[PDB]
Symmetry: D4
Amino acid sequence: SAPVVGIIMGSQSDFETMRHADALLTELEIPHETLIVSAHRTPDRLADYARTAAERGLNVIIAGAGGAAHLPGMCAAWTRLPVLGVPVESRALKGMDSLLSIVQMPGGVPVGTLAIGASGAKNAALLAASILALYNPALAARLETFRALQTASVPNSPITE
Amino acid sequence: APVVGIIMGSQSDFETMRHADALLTELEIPHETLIVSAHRTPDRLADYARTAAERGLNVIIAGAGGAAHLPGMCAAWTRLPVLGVPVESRALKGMDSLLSIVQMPGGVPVGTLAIGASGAKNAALLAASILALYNPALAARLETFRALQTASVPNSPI
Amino acid sequence: SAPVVGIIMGSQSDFETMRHADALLTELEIPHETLIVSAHRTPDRLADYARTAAERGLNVIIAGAGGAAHLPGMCAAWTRLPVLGVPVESRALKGMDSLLSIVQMPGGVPVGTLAIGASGAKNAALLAASILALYNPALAARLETFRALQTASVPNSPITE
Amino acid sequence: APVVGIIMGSQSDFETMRHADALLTELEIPHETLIVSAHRTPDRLADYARTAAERGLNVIIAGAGGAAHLPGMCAAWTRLPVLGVPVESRALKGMDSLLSIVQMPGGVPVGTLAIGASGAKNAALLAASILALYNPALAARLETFRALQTASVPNSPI
Amino acid sequence: SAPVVGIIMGSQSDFETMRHADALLTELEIPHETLIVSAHRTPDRLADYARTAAERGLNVIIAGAGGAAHLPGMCAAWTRLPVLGVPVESRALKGMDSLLSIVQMPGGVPVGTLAIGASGAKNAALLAASILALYNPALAARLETFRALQTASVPNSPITE
Amino acid sequence: APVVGIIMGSQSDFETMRHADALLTELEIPHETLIVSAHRTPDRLADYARTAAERGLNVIIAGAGGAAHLPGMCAAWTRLPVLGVPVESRALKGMDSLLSIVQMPGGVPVGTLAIGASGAKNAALLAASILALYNPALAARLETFRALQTASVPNSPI
Amino acid sequence: SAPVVGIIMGSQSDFETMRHADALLTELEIPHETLIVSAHRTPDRLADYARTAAERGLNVIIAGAGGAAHLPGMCAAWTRLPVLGVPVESRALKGMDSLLSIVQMPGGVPVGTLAIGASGAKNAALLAASILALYNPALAARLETFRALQTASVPNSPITE
Amino acid sequence: APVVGIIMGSQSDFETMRHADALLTELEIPHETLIVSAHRTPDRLADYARTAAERGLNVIIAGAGGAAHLPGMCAAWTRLPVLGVPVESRALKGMDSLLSIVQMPGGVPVGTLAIGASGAKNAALLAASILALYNPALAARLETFRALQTASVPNSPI
Ligand SMILES: [Cl-]
Ligand SMILES: [Cl-]
Ligand SMILES: [Cl-]
Ligand SMILES: [Cl-]
């Protein structure tokens, strides 16, 4: 059970957001690694991580960062793997800086970007699951089950109290 | 048979989404390029998304502007990876497009790319990266593309 | 007393906002239904709800959603009834994403959009009431009374304490 | 006799609001199209809004740009449904227009449509949807409009 | 001592902000009235207030409002007096809607706009004082004294604790 | 002798501030129209503001773009009412101009007008409203201006 | 040990942010002064401070301000020294007004601008240190040590609890 | 031998960054002007930044648009002062450029200048101010530049 998804983030504070991606991959039984890699404080670690990801058997990278969020884009610069980016909510600008720093990649090097915050982290895991489900029928079935339960769990009317 | 579907809300969107179409062709990825409007052809959208997987599609690239609902509603109906391209709007220059695509609630993802032509090109490349996981010949072509992209950058401005 | 307005929202969390529309329709004695319909998690429910609304006797739909708020627009895609949209305030972007996702409908499919949050929900009910009052003299009188009391309730000067 | 009033703050606004005028005509909805400035003709505005219902108007469509006060002040004076169209401003591209119209406090509503020509067209359609509740012939024409809009969308970009 | 400045606001909730203008005019000994006038709920009151302001001896109007803030602009539509506008901070959009709704008046009808919130209210009073000081030497002296004390009150270095 | 000073940071600002100049002339208000740069001529600015009152100026209208510091720094040095006009900037379309002028901390006010030509025209009118408090002939001309502005608004778009 | 960096700010409230610059210069053993200078309330103090800075032996000025933040720009107008600007987070607009007021200096008079808030203050000190390290080998060594420790302090994986 | 390096992500960026190049030349500061793409030539970037100090560079000026990562990634690899110029982007007019450069977390600074040509010119001037600390001849030329800039401002608009 070698990892097929890598979850990386710039700092421990990012884990409050990125833990939601970690949890969801575990629930879908997707082998993964969850690591801290700082674009700005460990740039050589980042370069090494990204340029060896494919040969290590990783299939998808989920990268989370806030503020001037460069981790997902610089990861994608160094790997042909799909890289998904999660904008971590920032204090002053509430993730608008995080979002624009990740999604506005110029043509040539993509980052598939999800919503600001916890929703984006969960959706990055689900998008990674969708990608892997293309080749893995068991996982495809688990993902379709997840989506069916999601749909069946929506009540018909709200609770008033 | 197409493995990527490129869909967009209107003819005018094609000025942007043609960059995705061109890139898929350059990488020799079989694809279909179609107009599907979330707001004006919602039943067409529902049928398209619902049947995508059984038709053999692997990735959907969806472009729209303004209150851009096409990628999110497509993802609501398929388990396939859906990639969203915010088309530049007249007034708000794609900021409305961008927020209405990227800010999907948890449970139904859309992988969102940059506003405009860059995003369309990158959606095609991201689709290619996804398909390359399973297809060694395509993976080689994608690596060639990235190598040429890197090698072609000049060292000084003219 | 079959419903003539439908209030729909994507989630239970939306009801904290949309309850203000519910309450106001009740105070104006407008028969209505209040339901959860998720654009993203129950898309078939949404399609069915919208395309049968008119034949069921509904006259106005009030739809609330937050973030990438697609519920009001997709409702309007499937019905000729007037659809009013309430942007629910979002955590990071404070409803700016909700607002733009609802109001910026391209030409052909309208959503009449109200303010972000509780004010917008109350005003959606009042706008629905204004629409229905065009054909219902009793309700027209109740609405004019509401507006008169509103005006008469404004004091001449503020309280200092 | 008009059942919809289209009003706008200035002649230049008509480049936008003419799309509402055209649509009402296409659907054969009797209407009046007028200039009423909140800031420059406030008494004209007060009289217009105050007398709208007794004149037989059912819906008011109001377009304005910048610090756009026309729709809100109109709604302050009438119990009729008032629909607001943010006109694209030079500097802020209608973001000022949009916020000054949509963010009405509770008690006095304005149903707000998109910035620019799309919003003007949609205000007319929303007015038509309102009037169709009571008018079977108009409801049929509106359903025809929506059916043609849906059916006319091509399947592939040229 | 008839009022020479009128402070008006849309609601009691606005007074938390506008009280700072009230207090400052009192400290500068400027006779004033402080009233609630709602653009949207008391439009006839507003029209009457603005169109009689000059003949009543008012010289400056300070108007505060939030959200779709129409009070200052509609006041200025009806009076030749200088009208100063204070954007009241709003819940979702933090006064950005208030600010744009007030400052972006088209050419022909001005509103002199101050900062969002308490700072803007204090500055509206000071700007009104500056206007009145043009014709009132006593007040000019009080205002120059205020500004001198303000300047003299700035310490040379911060306190660390 | 001038009773209003119009100042601006650069020649290019005059494309905007000329509208203030024209309006003051139309209302026959004696004024001076000058270039004063906060960033490039800070000593010129300090002397201008410091001496304004003793020179007989009653109002200063200051226009600037980008990180627009001219109105605020002028108000720092004079007790005269200072009115600020955000000049439209190339990239951010005057949003930077607007925030850097209007968001003055308490203690030193700048009465801020709209971004661009509208704001320049309105700064002149606001200056006129201030001066009309003391000058009956000017008050009459201003009332004539407002009456003509109101009366000139057409009733229907062409 | 005469100061070679001046840290200035408009108010005591700014020190909650600017103290981070003060602390960092002390830790890097860079002699500095930390002062309050208000652009709007002490404009003559500001002019004098900036135009004498170079002759006093200062090499870098770090200036912090919020809202309509004019202190860094007006400082740079009066000195040829490099001036670094720190946008202090504002209440309503969360430092967006601070940021734009500082960074958008027209061509001719630069302000090197750092992030909104505490991060920007720490980085202003580090940027000042980088500038001074060009001529000071001891400080260059201390700065390289700071950066090495920073890098070595990043863990490989997050803590889950 | 260059003491300032001007780098930018692409040829199109040079329309902006040429203003920095021109200014350094005007002040006779030896420099190199190069294309280095964070996203397309990340190894070129790493080598450039890592070796900058030992090559004798004192300041790096880096310009980029969109998700602008070039200045921050450069600062990650060098202890030299790095100055960042947000290049105006097509859709968001450099607001994305600006936020992705200025909002660096604590520990790795980038001194950020205005969006566009103004920022490029100011990055060169800020680099000059830094170098003038150590170089009396350059300090004199910079003071001459600032004196001419101040003295050249006209007193009235034409
Ligand atoms: Cl089409
Ligand atoms: Cl007109
Ligand atoms: Cl000039
Ligand atoms: Cl290139």
